[PDB]
Amino acid sequence: MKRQNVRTLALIVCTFTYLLVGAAVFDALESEPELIERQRLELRQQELRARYNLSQGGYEELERVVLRLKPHKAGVQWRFAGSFYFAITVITTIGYGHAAPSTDGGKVFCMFYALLGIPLTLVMFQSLGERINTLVRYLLHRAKKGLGMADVSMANMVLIGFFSCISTLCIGAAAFSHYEHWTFFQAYYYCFITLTTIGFGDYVALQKDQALQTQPQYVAFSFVYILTGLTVIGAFLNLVVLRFMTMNAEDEKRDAENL
Amino acid sequence: MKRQNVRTLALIVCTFTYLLVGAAVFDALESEPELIERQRLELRQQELRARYNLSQGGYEELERVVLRLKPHKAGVQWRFAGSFYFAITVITTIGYGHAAPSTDGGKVFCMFYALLGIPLTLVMFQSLGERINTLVRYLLHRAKKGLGADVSMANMVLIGFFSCISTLCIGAAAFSHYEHWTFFQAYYYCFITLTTIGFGDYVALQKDQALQTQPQYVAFSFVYILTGLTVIGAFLNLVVLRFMTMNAEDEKRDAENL
Ligand SMILES: CC(C)CCC[C@@H](C)[C@H]1CC[C@H]2[C@@H]3CC=C4C[C@@H](OC(=O)CCC(=O)O)CC[C@]4(C)[C@H]3CC[C@]12C
Ligand SMILES: CC(C)CCC[C@@H](C)[C@H]1CC[C@H]2[C@@H]3CC=C4C[C@@H](OC(=O)CCC(=O)O)CC[C@]4(C)[C@H]3CC[C@]12C
Ligand SMILES: CC(C)CCC[C@@H](C)[C@H]1CC[C@H]2[C@@H]3CC=C4C[C@@H](OC(=O)CCC(=O)O)CC[C@]4(C)[C@H]3CC[C@]12C
Ligand SMILES: CC(C)CCC[C@@H](C)[C@H]1CC[C@H]2[C@@H]3CC=C4C[C@@H](OC(=O)CCC(=O)O)CC[C@]4(C)[C@H]3CC[C@]12C
Ligand SMILES: O=C(c1ccccc1F)N1CCN(Cc2c(-c3ccc(Br)cc3)nc3ccccn23)CC1
Ligand SMILES: [K+]
Ligand SMILES: [K+]
Ligand SMILES: [K+]
Ligand SMILES: [K+]
């Protein structure tokens, strides 16, 4: 069997076993706490329904209002600042879902917006990421020549790259634990889930004390952090991961080259 | 100025102007509806508070319970089926957020899981995506030779783009049936899923305890998300990927001449 076919089959077997191992661990960590929390909330729901004389239909009518008011609770999510924050989440594939298009026209424009946006943003981060690596490689070469030597190795680049990722999450967690009044660990977890473009939406910045409309300085920092932070991670994947994606094309070209 | 520096600066100017234009359009389409909906719901909130004799504190007390019960309402999200669905959302960067780790140990394992997972998934989709393109290129060459021969880039972009619409439409038809959504809603869900945006406003396997009671539909939803991402992955491998390595190609050419 060809090297390309062995490599692809190995990756499929790897991903599926990684999913089974992952599902096994998340079950061990989250199954029991979820059952405990569900049982606990089922009691509070019955106690509050009894306290304020609420029927099955009465609670259900009140349930619809509370859920529909959730995106409005944070404040105005769709003026210029909120629409820009949303535009960021779309093209960067973060998609928190804290604010999603409620109109059919909004949903349609979002699809066309993402179709051209996501490739543009992806290419931009890989291009700027490469320029950052080229600058770091030049700075390190000049420093080595300065102290007394001079060639910049791949290992030196992986070290600077990995430290840049740690520092970015630490700087972010320092700021988001301050402004969003979270613990350093929570703010760090938010920064990790944001900059990996997972964006669960369990933690979202600019959703407290009408920040999008009343705190422009914090909003400016938040946009600059998300964009610069994604460039730092983007530069690191351009350095380590990207080379493995062109591997099948390199081996296929080599096959035609020999034959 | 070097080609690399002109290209990078052009892309930065492009992205920022695309963000300003985007923010301008979403404001025009969503600002007024949001103000109208906020005002409508605030009337219903006052009417329901009056109907069931509820105070400011009384409503707030029930508000906390309704919001906290939302992830539990869909059913058990953390057994083997729910943890596998969540494991998919993490490594594929979809991250609906319908179920997120509530424990410190869950949050920590999730971070290490993503750190190694996301690059493994990305490499896998680009590798399988390339193999699919190579097969399509072979099938088209054999067909051209058969009917009465070289496969162009333009022919590949056409088959690739049509495969993308076919995967969104097959998905939309299937999800609009099992989730009782409109074709447009199911299509929008398939688009937001396969682009890894994953807002979470529409999430499959969240009705009638599907994760625990409907294994056949759960099996289809796992297979669709994974195959669908391979179809989009193959298109980026063909069209987008070449432009990401362009800076490195130009930098190598600079050292080659000088
Ligand atoms: C902190 C983060 C950014 C680290 C990312 C780590 C990656 C560089 C790793 C994670 C999974 C790895 C892959 C896991 C499995 C394989 C199959 C493996 O296939 C074989 O050994 C058979 C074919 C052959 O001989 O090449 C080749 C390497 C590869 C693609 C690995 C390449 C390196 C990957 C992408
Ligand atoms: C090298 C790079 C990182 C610099 C990029 C330029 C930044 C300085 C720009 C890009 C986006 C800008 C933000 C885009 C949107 C807004 C919302 C804006 O708020 C309003 O207009 C309030 C009223 C409304 O919400 O309609 C205040 C400025 C701010 C934070 C901007 C501040 C300046 C930012 C961060
Ligand atoms: C349906 C989807 C998957 C389609 C994806 C379309 C992409 C192939 C497009 C979208 C934005 C485009 C980019 C927008 C801007 C530029 C800057 C442009 O820069 C210059 O013209 C100056 C430097 C030079 O001469 O190369 C080079 C092409 C590039 C990277 C474009 C390459 C092709 C991109 C990535
Ligand atoms: C190469 C590709 C096209 C095929 C990959 C193999 C599939 C046939 C596998 C991969 C993941 C599997 C699923 C992983 C998890 C589950 C949950 C499982 O449900 C339970 O175990 C119920 C109890 C619980 O949740 O603890 C039922 C089978 C199912 C849908 C599996 C069905 C078979 C699937 C889709
Ligand atoms: O934003 C980043 C990024 C993240 C970290 C650091 C810097 C970055 F730039 N992305 C973009 C989103 N994602 C690419 C991606 C797509 C995919 C892309 C475009 C389209 Br269109 C459709 C689908 N599918 C999958 C499936 C599994 C894993 C990854 N997948 C990771 C890199
Ligand atoms: K994503
Ligand atoms: K989300
Ligand atoms: K996402
Ligand atoms: K998401």
Side-chain angles (χ1 to χ4, degrees), chain A residues 5 18 27 30-31 34 61 68 77-78 80 93 95 102-103 107 111 113 127 131 192 197 199 203 248 252, chain B residues 5 18 27 30-31 34 44 52 77-78 93 95 102-103 107 111 113 127 131 191 196 198 202 247 251:
Chain A
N5 296 334
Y18 198 76
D27 194 321
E30 296 285 337
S31 295
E34 193 203 16
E61 283 188 67
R68 284 184 83 174
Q77 307 268 34
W78 287 113
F80 181 59
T93 73
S102 61
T103 68
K107 284 182 172 161
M111 291 191 278
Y113 190 71
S127 295
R131 299 320 296 155
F192 185 89
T197 70
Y203 287 83
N248 267 357
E252 194 70 36
Chain B
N5 296 335
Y18 201 76
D27 196 316
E30 296 285 338
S31 295
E34 194 205 9
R44 267 172 68 177
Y52 305 96
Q77 307 268 34
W78 287 113
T93 73
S102 61
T103 68
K107 283 183 171 162
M111 290 192 279
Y113 190 71
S127 295
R131 299 319 297 155
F191 185 89
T196 70
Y202 290 92
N247 267 20
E251 195 71 35

Short mmCIF file of all heavy atoms in Angstrom, two decimals, chain A residues 5 18 27 30-31 34 61 68 77-78 80 93 95 102-103 107 111 113 127 131 192 197 199 203 248 252, chain B residues 5 18 27 30-31 34 44 52 77-78 93 95 102-103 107 111 113 127 131 191 196 198 202 247 251:
data_model
loop_
_atom_site.label_atom_id
_atom_site.label_comp_id
_atom_site.label_asym_id
_atom_site.label_seq_id
_atom_site.Cartn_x
_atom_site.Cartn_y
_atom_site.Cartn_z
N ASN A 5 -1.93 6.43 1.41
CA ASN A 5 -3.05 5.62 1.85
C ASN A 5 -2.86 5.05 3.26
O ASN A 5 -3.83 4.97 4.02
CB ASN A 5 -3.37 4.52 0.84
CG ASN A 5 -3.84 5.04 -0.51
OD1 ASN A 5 -4.40 6.13 -0.64
ND2 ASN A 5 -3.62 4.24 -1.55
N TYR A 18 -9.42 8.37 19.40
CA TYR A 18 -9.29 9.59 20.20
C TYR A 18 -10.68 10.06 20.65
O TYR A 18 -10.83 10.56 21.76
CB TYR A 18 -8.59 10.70 19.39
CG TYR A 18 -8.01 11.82 20.23
CD1 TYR A 18 -6.84 11.65 20.95
CD2 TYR A 18 -8.61 13.07 20.24
CE1 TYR A 18 -6.30 12.69 21.71
CE2 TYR A 18 -8.09 14.12 21.00
CZ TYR A 18 -6.93 13.92 21.73
OH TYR A 18 -6.42 14.95 22.48
N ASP A 27 -17.29 11.09 30.25
CA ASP A 27 -18.33 10.32 30.94
C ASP A 27 -17.93 10.21 32.42
O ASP A 27 -18.74 10.52 33.29
CB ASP A 27 -18.45 8.91 30.31
CG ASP A 27 -19.68 8.09 30.66
OD1 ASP A 27 -20.12 8.13 31.83
OD2 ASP A 27 -20.18 7.38 29.78
N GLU A 30 -18.02 14.02 33.95
CA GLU A 30 -19.25 14.82 33.93
C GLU A 30 -20.60 14.10 34.17
O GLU A 30 -21.54 14.79 34.58
CB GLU A 30 -19.34 15.58 32.60
CG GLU A 30 -18.25 16.62 32.37
CD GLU A 30 -18.37 17.91 33.17
OE1 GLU A 30 -19.49 18.27 33.60
OE2 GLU A 30 -17.33 18.59 33.35
N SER A 31 -20.71 12.78 33.93
CA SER A 31 -21.97 12.03 34.09
C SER A 31 -22.61 12.14 35.47
O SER A 31 -23.77 12.56 35.55
CB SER A 31 -21.81 10.56 33.72
OG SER A 31 -21.52 10.40 32.34
N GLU A 34 -23.66 15.83 36.65
CA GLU A 34 -24.84 16.22 35.87
C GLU A 34 -26.11 15.62 36.46
O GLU A 34 -27.11 16.34 36.57
CB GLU A 34 -24.68 15.79 34.40
CG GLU A 34 -25.70 16.43 33.47
CD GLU A 34 -25.98 15.70 32.17
OE1 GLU A 34 -25.62 14.51 32.05
OE2 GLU A 34 -26.57 16.34 31.27
N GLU A 61 -45.35 28.80 30.35
CA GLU A 61 -45.56 30.13 29.76
C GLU A 61 -44.46 31.09 30.23
O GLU A 61 -43.96 31.89 29.44
CB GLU A 61 -46.93 30.72 30.14
CG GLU A 61 -48.12 30.14 29.40
CD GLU A 61 -49.43 30.87 29.66
OE1 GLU A 61 -49.55 32.04 29.25
OE2 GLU A 61 -50.33 30.27 30.28
N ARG A 68 -36.36 33.48 26.03
CA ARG A 68 -36.36 34.46 24.94
C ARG A 68 -35.72 35.79 25.35
O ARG A 68 -35.19 36.49 24.49
CB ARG A 68 -37.78 34.67 24.39
CG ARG A 68 -38.25 33.54 23.48
CD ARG A 68 -39.62 33.82 22.87
NE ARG A 68 -39.53 34.68 21.68
CZ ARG A 68 -40.55 34.99 20.89
NH1 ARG A 68 -41.77 34.52 21.14
NH2 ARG A 68 -40.36 35.78 19.84
N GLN A 77 -27.27 43.83 21.56
CA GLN A 77 -26.29 42.97 20.89
C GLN A 77 -26.15 43.28 19.40
O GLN A 77 -25.31 42.67 18.74
CB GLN A 77 -26.70 41.49 21.04
CG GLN A 77 -26.97 41.03 22.47
CD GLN A 77 -25.77 40.44 23.16
OE1 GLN A 77 -24.62 40.85 22.96
NE2 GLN A 77 -26.03 39.46 24.02
N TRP A 78 -26.99 44.18 18.86
CA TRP A 78 -26.97 44.38 17.42
C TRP A 78 -26.69 45.80 16.92
O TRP A 78 -26.78 46.00 15.70
CB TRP A 78 -28.28 43.86 16.80
CG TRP A 78 -28.34 42.36 16.78
CD1 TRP A 78 -29.19 41.56 17.49
CD2 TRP A 78 -27.49 41.47 16.03
NE1 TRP A 78 -28.93 40.24 17.22
CE2 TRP A 78 -27.91 40.15 16.31
CE3 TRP A 78 -26.45 41.67 15.11
CZ2 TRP A 78 -27.31 39.04 15.72
CZ3 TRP A 78 -25.86 40.56 14.52
CH2 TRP A 78 -26.29 39.26 14.83
N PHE A 80 -23.75 49.02 16.24
CA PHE A 80 -22.46 48.88 15.53
C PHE A 80 -21.44 48.00 16.27
O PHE A 80 -20.86 47.12 15.64
CB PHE A 80 -21.86 50.23 15.11
CG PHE A 80 -20.55 50.13 14.36
CD1 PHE A 80 -20.45 49.42 13.17
CD2 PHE A 80 -19.40 50.73 14.87
CE1 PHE A 80 -19.22 49.29 12.51
CE2 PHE A 80 -18.19 50.63 14.18
CZ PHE A 80 -18.11 49.90 13.01
N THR A 93 -14.74 31.78 12.77
CA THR A 93 -15.38 30.49 13.09
C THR A 93 -15.52 30.23 14.60
O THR A 93 -15.80 29.10 14.99
CB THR A 93 -14.72 29.27 12.37
OG1 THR A 93 -13.47 28.97 12.96
CG2 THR A 93 -14.56 29.47 10.88
N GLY A 95 -17.91 31.62 16.69
CA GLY A 95 -19.36 31.50 16.82
C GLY A 95 -19.87 31.14 18.20
O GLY A 95 -20.40 30.04 18.38
N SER A 102 -31.67 36.61 14.18
CA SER A 102 -33.06 36.26 14.46
C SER A 102 -33.94 36.35 13.20
O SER A 102 -34.99 35.71 13.15
CB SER A 102 -33.62 37.13 15.58
OG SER A 102 -33.61 38.51 15.24
N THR A 103 -33.51 37.14 12.19
CA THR A 103 -34.25 37.31 10.93
C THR A 103 -33.73 36.41 9.83
O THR A 103 -32.54 36.06 9.81
CB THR A 103 -34.26 38.78 10.47
OG1 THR A 103 -32.94 39.18 10.10
CG2 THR A 103 -34.83 39.74 11.51
N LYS A 107 -29.89 35.64 8.66
CA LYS A 107 -29.41 34.26 8.50
C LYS A 107 -28.82 34.02 7.11
O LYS A 107 -27.79 33.36 7.00
CB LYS A 107 -30.55 33.26 8.79
CG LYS A 107 -30.85 33.09 10.27
CD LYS A 107 -31.93 32.06 10.56
CE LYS A 107 -32.04 31.80 12.04
NZ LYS A 107 -33.33 31.19 12.41
N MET A 111 -24.71 33.58 5.91
CA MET A 111 -24.21 32.45 5.13
C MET A 111 -23.28 32.91 3.99
O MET A 111 -22.18 32.37 3.87
CB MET A 111 -25.36 31.56 4.62
CG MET A 111 -26.04 30.79 5.72
SD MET A 111 -27.18 29.51 5.14
CE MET A 111 -28.62 30.48 4.80
N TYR A 113 -21.80 35.85 3.89
CA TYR A 113 -20.76 36.57 4.63
C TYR A 113 -19.65 35.61 5.07
O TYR A 113 -18.47 35.93 4.93
CB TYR A 113 -21.37 37.30 5.83
CG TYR A 113 -20.43 38.25 6.53
CD1 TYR A 113 -20.05 39.45 5.93
CD2 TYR A 113 -19.94 37.97 7.81
CE1 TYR A 113 -19.18 40.33 6.57
CE2 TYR A 113 -19.08 38.86 8.46
CZ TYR A 113 -18.69 40.03 7.83
OH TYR A 113 -17.84 40.91 8.46
N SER A 127 -0.97 34.18 6.64
CA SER A 127 -0.07 35.14 6.01
C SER A 127 0.62 36.02 7.05
O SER A 127 1.85 36.11 7.04
CB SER A 127 -0.80 35.99 4.98
OG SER A 127 -1.27 35.18 3.91
N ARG A 131 4.63 36.07 8.57
CA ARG A 131 5.39 37.32 8.68
C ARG A 131 5.93 37.51 10.09
O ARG A 131 7.05 38.00 10.24
CB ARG A 131 4.56 38.55 8.26
CG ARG A 131 4.05 38.59 6.81
CD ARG A 131 5.00 38.10 5.73
NE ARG A 131 6.20 38.92 5.62
CZ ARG A 131 7.36 38.48 5.14
NH1 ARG A 131 7.49 37.22 4.74
NH2 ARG A 131 8.40 39.30 5.07
N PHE A 192 -8.63 30.11 25.93
CA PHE A 192 -8.27 28.89 25.22
C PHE A 192 -9.38 28.49 24.23
O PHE A 192 -9.08 28.29 23.06
CB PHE A 192 -7.92 27.73 26.19
CG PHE A 192 -7.42 26.49 25.48
CD1 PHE A 192 -6.07 26.32 25.20
CD2 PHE A 192 -8.32 25.51 25.05
CE1 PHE A 192 -5.62 25.20 24.50
CE2 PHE A 192 -7.86 24.39 24.36
CZ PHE A 192 -6.52 24.24 24.09
N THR A 197 -10.94 28.59 18.38
CA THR A 197 -12.18 28.80 17.61
C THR A 197 -13.29 27.79 17.95
O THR A 197 -14.24 27.64 17.18
CB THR A 197 -11.92 28.90 16.09
OG1 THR A 197 -11.54 27.63 15.55
CG2 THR A 197 -10.93 29.97 15.74
N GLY A 199 -15.29 28.10 20.75
CA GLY A 199 -16.32 29.06 21.15
C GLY A 199 -17.65 28.47 21.59
O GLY A 199 -18.66 28.67 20.91
N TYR A 203 -18.85 31.13 28.34
CA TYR A 203 -18.10 32.30 28.78
C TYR A 203 -17.96 33.19 27.54
O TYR A 203 -17.52 32.70 26.49
CB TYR A 203 -16.72 31.88 29.33
CG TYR A 203 -16.78 31.22 30.69
CD1 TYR A 203 -17.07 29.87 30.82
CD2 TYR A 203 -16.54 31.95 31.86
CE1 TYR A 203 -17.15 29.26 32.07
CE2 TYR A 203 -16.59 31.34 33.11
CZ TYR A 203 -16.90 30.00 33.21
OH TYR A 203 -16.98 29.40 34.45
N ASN A 248 0.37 14.60 1.77
CA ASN A 248 -0.23 13.69 0.78
C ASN A 248 0.03 14.17 -0.65
O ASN A 248 0.26 13.34 -1.54
CB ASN A 248 -1.73 13.50 1.05
CG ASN A 248 -2.07 12.30 1.92
OD1 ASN A 248 -1.21 11.51 2.32
ND2 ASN A 248 -3.35 12.14 2.22
N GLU A 252 2.32 12.29 -3.57
CA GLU A 252 1.65 12.04 -4.86
C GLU A 252 2.49 12.62 -6.01
O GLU A 252 2.57 12.00 -7.07
CB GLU A 252 0.23 12.63 -4.85
CG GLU A 252 -0.67 12.16 -5.99
CD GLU A 252 -1.14 10.71 -5.97
OE1 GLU A 252 -1.40 10.18 -4.87
OE2 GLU A 252 -1.27 10.12 -7.06
N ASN B 5 5.00 41.10 1.83
CA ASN B 5 4.57 42.24 2.64
C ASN B 5 3.37 42.97 2.04
O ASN B 5 2.50 43.41 2.79
CB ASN B 5 5.73 43.18 2.92
CG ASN B 5 6.83 42.58 3.76
OD1 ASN B 5 6.64 41.64 4.55
ND2 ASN B 5 8.04 43.11 3.62
N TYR B 18 -13.93 44.26 5.58
CA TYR B 18 -14.96 43.23 5.51
C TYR B 18 -15.73 43.18 6.83
O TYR B 18 -16.94 42.94 6.83
CB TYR B 18 -14.33 41.86 5.20
CG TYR B 18 -15.30 40.85 4.62
CD1 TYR B 18 -15.69 40.93 3.29
CD2 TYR B 18 -15.78 39.79 5.38
CE1 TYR B 18 -16.57 39.99 2.74
CE2 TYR B 18 -16.65 38.85 4.84
CZ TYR B 18 -17.04 38.95 3.52
OH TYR B 18 -17.90 38.03 2.97
N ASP B 27 -26.23 45.54 11.41
CA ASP B 27 -26.87 46.63 12.15
C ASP B 27 -28.19 46.96 11.44
O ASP B 27 -29.23 47.01 12.08
CB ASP B 27 -25.95 47.87 12.16
CG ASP B 27 -26.28 48.95 13.18
OD1 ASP B 27 -27.48 49.29 13.32
OD2 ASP B 27 -25.34 49.48 13.80
N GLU B 30 -30.59 43.66 11.82
CA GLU B 30 -30.95 43.11 13.13
C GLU B 30 -31.24 44.12 14.26
O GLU B 30 -31.94 43.72 15.20
CB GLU B 30 -29.87 42.13 13.61
CG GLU B 30 -29.70 40.89 12.76
CD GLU B 30 -30.76 39.81 12.86
OE1 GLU B 30 -31.48 39.76 13.89
OE2 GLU B 30 -30.85 39.01 11.91
N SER B 31 -30.73 45.38 14.20
CA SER B 31 -30.95 46.40 15.25
C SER B 31 -32.41 46.67 15.58
O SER B 31 -32.80 46.51 16.74
CB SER B 31 -30.24 47.70 14.93
OG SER B 31 -28.83 47.54 14.92
N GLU B 34 -34.51 43.55 16.94
CA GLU B 34 -34.07 43.29 18.32
C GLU B 34 -34.78 44.23 19.30
O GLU B 34 -35.24 43.77 20.35
CB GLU B 34 -32.55 43.42 18.44
CG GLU B 34 -31.99 42.86 19.74
CD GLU B 34 -30.68 43.44 20.22
OE1 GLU B 34 -30.20 44.44 19.63
OE2 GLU B 34 -30.12 42.89 21.20
N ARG B 44 -45.01 40.99 27.63
CA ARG B 44 -45.41 39.63 28.01
C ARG B 44 -44.94 39.30 29.42
O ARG B 44 -45.67 38.67 30.17
CB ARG B 44 -44.85 38.60 27.02
CG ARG B 44 -45.81 38.26 25.89
CD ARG B 44 -45.16 37.40 24.81
NE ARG B 44 -44.83 36.06 25.30
CZ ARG B 44 -44.31 35.09 24.54
NH1 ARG B 44 -44.06 35.30 23.25
NH2 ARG B 44 -44.04 33.90 25.06
N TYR B 52 -49.90 35.82 37.42
CA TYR B 52 -49.55 34.81 38.43
C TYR B 52 -49.00 35.43 39.73
O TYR B 52 -48.31 34.76 40.49
CB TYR B 52 -48.59 33.76 37.84
CG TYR B 52 -49.12 33.08 36.59
CD1 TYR B 52 -48.75 33.53 35.33
CD2 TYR B 52 -49.97 31.99 36.67
CE1 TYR B 52 -49.24 32.92 34.17
CE2 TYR B 52 -50.46 31.37 35.53
CZ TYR B 52 -50.10 31.84 34.28
OH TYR B 52 -50.57 31.23 33.14
N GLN B 77 -26.90 14.69 28.69
CA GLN B 77 -25.90 15.18 27.73
C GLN B 77 -24.51 14.60 27.99
O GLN B 77 -23.60 14.89 27.21
CB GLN B 77 -25.80 16.72 27.81
CG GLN B 77 -27.13 17.47 27.68
CD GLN B 77 -27.46 17.88 26.27
OE1 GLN B 77 -27.16 17.18 25.28
NE2 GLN B 77 -28.12 19.02 26.13
N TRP B 78 -24.33 13.83 29.07
CA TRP B 78 -22.98 13.38 29.40
C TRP B 78 -22.75 11.87 29.49
O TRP B 78 -21.63 11.49 29.86
CB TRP B 78 -22.50 14.07 30.69
CG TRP B 78 -22.16 15.52 30.48
CD1 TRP B 78 -22.82 16.60 31.00
CD2 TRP B 78 -21.11 16.05 29.65
NE1 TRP B 78 -22.22 17.77 30.57
CE2 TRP B 78 -21.17 17.46 29.75
CE3 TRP B 78 -20.08 15.47 28.89
CZ2 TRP B 78 -20.26 18.29 29.08
CZ3 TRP B 78 -19.19 16.30 28.23
CH2 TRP B 78 -19.28 17.69 28.34
N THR B 93 -13.73 21.85 16.29
CA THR B 93 -13.85 23.29 16.61
C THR B 93 -15.28 23.83 16.38
O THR B 93 -15.45 25.05 16.36
CB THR B 93 -12.79 24.18 15.90
OG1 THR B 93 -13.06 24.29 14.50
CG2 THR B 93 -11.37 23.70 16.13
N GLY B 95 -17.99 23.39 18.48
CA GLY B 95 -18.33 23.85 19.82
C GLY B 95 -19.66 24.56 19.96
O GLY B 95 -19.68 25.76 20.23
N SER B 102 -18.98 21.39 33.11
CA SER B 102 -19.39 22.10 34.32
C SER B 102 -18.37 21.95 35.46
O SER B 102 -18.33 22.79 36.36
CB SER B 102 -20.78 21.64 34.77
OG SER B 102 -20.80 20.26 35.07
N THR B 103 -17.53 20.89 35.40
CA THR B 103 -16.50 20.63 36.41
C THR B 103 -15.12 21.14 35.99
O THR B 103 -14.81 21.21 34.80
CB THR B 103 -16.43 19.13 36.77
OG1 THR B 103 -15.94 18.38 35.66
CG2 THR B 103 -17.76 18.57 37.27
N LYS B 107 -13.19 20.80 32.42
CA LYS B 107 -12.63 21.99 31.77
C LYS B 107 -11.14 21.82 31.44
O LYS B 107 -10.72 22.21 30.36
CB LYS B 107 -12.85 23.24 32.63
CG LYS B 107 -14.27 23.77 32.56
CD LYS B 107 -14.46 25.04 33.34
CE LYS B 107 -15.82 25.62 33.05
NZ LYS B 107 -16.26 26.60 34.07
N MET B 111 -9.25 21.12 27.65
CA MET B 111 -8.16 21.95 27.13
C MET B 111 -7.03 21.10 26.56
O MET B 111 -6.60 21.35 25.43
CB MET B 111 -7.66 22.95 28.18
CG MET B 111 -8.64 24.05 28.48
SD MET B 111 -7.92 25.39 29.45
CE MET B 111 -8.01 24.69 31.09
N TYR B 113 -7.31 17.94 25.70
CA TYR B 113 -8.00 17.16 24.66
C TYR B 113 -8.02 17.91 23.33
O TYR B 113 -7.74 17.31 22.29
CB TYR B 113 -9.43 16.81 25.12
CG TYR B 113 -10.13 15.81 24.24
CD1 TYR B 113 -9.74 14.47 24.23
CD2 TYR B 113 -11.20 16.18 23.44
CE1 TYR B 113 -10.37 13.54 23.41
CE2 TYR B 113 -11.85 15.25 22.63
CZ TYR B 113 -11.43 13.93 22.61
OH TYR B 113 -12.07 13.01 21.82
N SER B 127 -5.91 15.25 4.86
CA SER B 127 -5.37 14.03 4.28
C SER B 127 -6.46 13.24 3.54
O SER B 127 -6.25 12.89 2.38
CB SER B 127 -4.71 13.16 5.35
OG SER B 127 -3.57 13.81 5.90
N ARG B 131 -7.26 12.65 -0.63
CA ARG B 131 -7.54 11.32 -1.18
C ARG B 131 -8.84 11.31 -1.97
O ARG B 131 -8.92 10.65 -3.01
CB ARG B 131 -7.57 10.23 -0.09
CG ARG B 131 -6.27 10.01 0.72
CD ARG B 131 -4.96 10.05 -0.07
NE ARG B 131 -4.87 8.99 -1.07
CZ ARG B 131 -4.12 9.07 -2.16
NH1 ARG B 131 -3.40 10.16 -2.41
NH2 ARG B 131 -4.08 8.06 -3.03
N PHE B 191 -25.02 24.51 7.35
CA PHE B 191 -24.01 25.48 6.94
C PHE B 191 -23.15 25.89 8.15
O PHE B 191 -21.93 25.80 8.07
CB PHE B 191 -24.64 26.70 6.23
CG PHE B 191 -23.60 27.67 5.68
CD1 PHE B 191 -23.10 27.51 4.40
CD2 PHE B 191 -23.09 28.69 6.48
CE1 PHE B 191 -22.08 28.36 3.92
CE2 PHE B 191 -22.08 29.54 6.00
CZ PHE B 191 -21.58 29.36 4.73
N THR B 196 -17.79 25.09 10.89
CA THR B 196 -17.30 25.01 12.27
C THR B 196 -17.60 26.28 13.08
O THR B 196 -16.98 26.49 14.13
CB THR B 196 -15.81 24.60 12.37
OG1 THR B 196 -14.96 25.63 11.89
CG2 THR B 196 -15.54 23.29 11.68
N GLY B 198 -20.70 26.92 14.48
CA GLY B 198 -21.46 26.30 15.55
C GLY B 198 -21.96 27.23 16.63
O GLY B 198 -21.52 27.14 17.78
N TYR B 202 -29.29 26.11 16.83
CA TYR B 202 -29.87 24.89 16.26
C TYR B 202 -28.83 23.80 16.54
O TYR B 202 -27.66 24.00 16.19
CB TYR B 202 -30.14 25.04 14.75
CG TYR B 202 -31.27 25.99 14.42
CD1 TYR B 202 -31.03 27.34 14.19
CD2 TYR B 202 -32.58 25.54 14.35
CE1 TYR B 202 -32.07 28.22 13.91
CE2 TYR B 202 -33.63 26.41 14.08
CZ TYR B 202 -33.37 27.75 13.86
OH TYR B 202 -34.41 28.62 13.60
N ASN B 247 3.22 32.66 1.22
CA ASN B 247 4.21 33.53 1.87
C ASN B 247 5.54 32.79 2.02
O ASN B 247 6.59 33.36 1.73
CB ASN B 247 3.71 34.01 3.23
CG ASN B 247 2.98 35.33 3.23
OD1 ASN B 247 2.49 35.82 2.20
ND2 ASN B 247 2.89 35.95 4.39
N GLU B 251 9.10 33.55 0.18
CA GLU B 251 10.28 33.74 1.04
C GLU B 251 11.42 32.81 0.61
O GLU B 251 12.58 33.23 0.63
CB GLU B 251 9.92 33.53 2.52
CG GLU B 251 10.96 34.05 3.51
CD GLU B 251 11.12 35.55 3.66
OE1 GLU B 251 10.11 36.29 3.55
OE2 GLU B 251 12.26 35.99 3.90
#
